[PDB]
Amino acid sequence: TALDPTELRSSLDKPFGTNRVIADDAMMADSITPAQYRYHHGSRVRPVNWNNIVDDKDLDVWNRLIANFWLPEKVPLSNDIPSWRSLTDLERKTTTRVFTGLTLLDTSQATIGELCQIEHARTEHEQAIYTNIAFMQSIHARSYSSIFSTLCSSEEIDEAYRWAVGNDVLQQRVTTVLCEYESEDPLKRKIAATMLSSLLLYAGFYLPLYFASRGKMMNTADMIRLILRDKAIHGYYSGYKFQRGLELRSENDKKNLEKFTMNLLDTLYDLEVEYSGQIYEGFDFHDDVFDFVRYNANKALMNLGYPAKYSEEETHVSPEILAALSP
Amino acid sequence: PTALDPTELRSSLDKPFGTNRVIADDAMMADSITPAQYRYHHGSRVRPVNWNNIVDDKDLDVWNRLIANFWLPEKVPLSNDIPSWRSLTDLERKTTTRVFTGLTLLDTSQATIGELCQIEHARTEHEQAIYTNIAFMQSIHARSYSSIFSTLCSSEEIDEAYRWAVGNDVLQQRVTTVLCEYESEDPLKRKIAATMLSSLLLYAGFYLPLYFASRGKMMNTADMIRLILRDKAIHGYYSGYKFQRGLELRSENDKKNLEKFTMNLLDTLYDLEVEYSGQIYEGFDFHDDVFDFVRYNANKALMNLGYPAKYSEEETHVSPEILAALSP
């Protein structure tokens, strides 16, 4: 039926009774998580039970992500102020723009991208993990503003955010991902999330890693490595859960999901060349940036269980950038 | 399941953005949107969160306080309550495990959908980030009841309590009543429900560990409960604050609808609390004090939404021992 705006939406459903029983095995098996309720009105909803782990990997990932909790306030970013001032004008402008673009991807993952993975999650503990990951992705996004607050003028921050809104290719990149989060196929959401965490930010992460390899912006680099410590697990876990859902799908669906994955990757790679090629046009490390992009694209594919797409020659990251990845 | 070929990107259905790069003028910035709003505004430009452009100072204050209050159940020495737990009666232990499993169900719901559905129609981008912290901390709350069970309970006791919760019709009616409102397209109905969850629905359960602490029992568990209460008091205040920020931009028609809806939801949830917690606490002499405490917190939920109190001082007189237990 229809509903008056003052009435409760649950009045459209059959009420549960007032019976109390100790649920038997069938009643427990038919119970569902709260995020599934909207598809199954009248089903019984089950609280999370951390003393009944279904996949031991979930407990390990939960414990590790929580133990890695950090805040940008704990990094002495203000000790980068002399280094920041020693950069060129172009270096400072490029940093603010790159980091504002990274903010846009992490904002997207925090506020919808990671959350849209909950309703079709394989386990209730995995659902709780996505709530931690989304909060930490809000921390990642917030931390780029922490950098700007320490180093930048209001005018610099203002122009960088206007540049981001006004950058058509950046808009194409983020909206490409956001559309897949709406997919009716839960595994396409997981593929997109794995791409965000294991690929889409790395052309940007190249810049602070480059600064660190040159001895600059050293404290900022520590924070970037805290972000990377999170994202490496985020992307591994997204891809692991994709593979656990994939093994239950039909052969035809597996073929289509692999084709879709390569279509998504190829589209996002071409967009990265367009976007970061233009951003880095006044820098002589163009070729190394895309070796590094392809290097991380292979990791994203491996996280999904697919073979590497790019060759050793196409993924040869300079040894100074790889050294800057570790503390 | 749509008719788009499964290998195609869903963005292929939309006109792509161009290849222009401009410094967005004020009109372009005003029309930009948060990522969570993109779903029903395809083609709009999406904007990254700017913590150096705070729209509502209250958002920065709430964010900073909630993050400062981060805690984990592993830091509470719950195992020091094992002697106190074993000094209780079997009925007290069974009642506690069941009550906490019912609290787990409400926090599980809020963590995994209830708080997260507040993001898409949030007033500010910083508020959206705050909801991600709140949802995570609600997962911590739900997790923390399992931490209690792992410390105090046998495998059989935990298993039976989860079966009790799934099989408790009234508990199911309570949770699904809230879950249904989170499906409304009216963001303020979502906000009212979240305010009720954080400021009312768990308090008949919280009464029990406060009662034990007032009798000198389960003292370390009480500390953890106070950590949970320290979060929920802000969660409920903030949900109600944001409701009022949205409410003041609504028509007189919608204001009248939302006030009646609020009282309908409260009245329904209250009656269900009487049925649910009245049955659970039937064997205890504090039964009537529980509902003074329920009505006391119902008044706080209403006050958080900006509405007048419903219950009188005589209907909300919580015993001084329970109120003292709320403090360290």
Author numbering:
A (entry chain B): 7 to 333
B (entry chain A): 6 to 333
Paste lines from the article:
We first crystallized R2 expressed alone and solved the structure of unmodified BvR2eQSK (BvR2QSK-tyr) at 1.8 Å resolution in space group P3121 with four monomers in the asymmetric unit forming two homodimers that correspond to the physiological active form of other R2 subunits. The N-terminus is extended and contacts the second monomer of the dimer, creating a large interaction surface of about 4300 Å2 and forming 6 salt bridges between the monomers. The active site residues are well-defined. There are no metal ions observed in the active site. The remaining glutamates that usually bind metals in the site are as expected from the sequence substituted to Q143, S203 and K237. The position of Mn1 is occupied by the ε-ammonium group of K237 and in the position of Mn2 a well-defined water is bound. The DOPA containing R2eQSK can support ribonucleotide reduction in vitro while the unmodified protein cannot.
Class I ribonucleotide reductases (RNRs) convert ribonucleotides into deoxyribonucleotides under oxic conditions. In R2e, three of the otherwise strictly conserved metal-binding glutamates in the active site are substituted.
